[PDB]
Structure formats: structure tokens, C-alpha cells
Design a protein around this ligand. Structure first.
Ligand SMILES: *[C@@H]1O[C@H](CO)[C@@H](O)[C@H](O)[C@H]1NC(C)=O
Ligand SMILES: *[C@@H]1O[C@H](CO)[C@@H](O)[C@H](O)[C@H]1NC(C)=O
Lengths: 49, 19
């Protein structure tokens, strides 16, 4: 759900679009995530590992 | 490079006024 579960009813939303929202919230455009999605995913997986 | 994009058309606020 993202952040909607803590401010009211839960709203379904894809995780990449939630990441795009979180990147746009700090000033970074959504294109760098919708284009370089595999790199961000691999970096996140490497960090989790 | 975008994964999950579909084909669609966008509108132009200049073409109908110019043509
Ligand atoms: C959603 O994920 C499924 C499973 O990988 C895939 O088959 C489908 O094409 C995806 N849809 C979009 C719009 O990316
Ligand atoms: C979009 O159009 C291109 C060529 O016009 C085609 O190769 C592609 O398969 C189309 N995609 C969808 C989701 O219709």
C-alpha cells in the first residue's frame, strides 16, 4: 500500500510506482527510476544481502 | 527501456488551433 495504510484506508499500488513517488518526493524525477529500474533493483538486492 | 508501458496517444494544445 505504501503510506496509505497509516493515514486511512489501504490503497493498492505497484511497488515501482511507490518508489517513483518516493523519488519524486525528494526532488528526483521519476524517469531515472522508470528507466534504470534493473540497476536500482540489483543495488537494493545487494544491500539486503 | 521502460518496462510495462502501453501504446496510447496524447493530445496537443497547439495542433488544432494551428490547423
Ligand atoms: C506484471 O507481472 C507479470 C509477472 O511477471 C507479467 O507477466 C506482466 O507482464 C506484468 N505486467 C506489466 C504491465 O508489467
Ligand atoms: C506498440 O506498438 C509497437 C509498434 O507500433 C509494437 O511493436 C508493440 O508491440 C505495441 N505494444 C503494445 C502493448 O501494443
Amino acid at each position: 500500500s505504501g503510506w496509505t495504510f497509516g493515514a486511512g484506508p489501504a490503497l493498492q499500488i505497484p511497488f515501482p510506482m511507490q518508489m517513483a513517488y518516493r523519488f519524486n518526493g525528494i526532488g528526483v524525477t521519476q524517469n531515472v527510476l522508470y528507466e534504470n529500474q534493473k540497476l536500482i533493483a540489483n543495488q537494493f538486492n545487494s544491500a539486503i544481502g | 527501456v521502460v518496462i510495462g508501458i502501453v501504446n496510447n496517444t496524447v493530445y496537443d494544445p497547439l495542433q488544432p488551433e494551428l490547423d
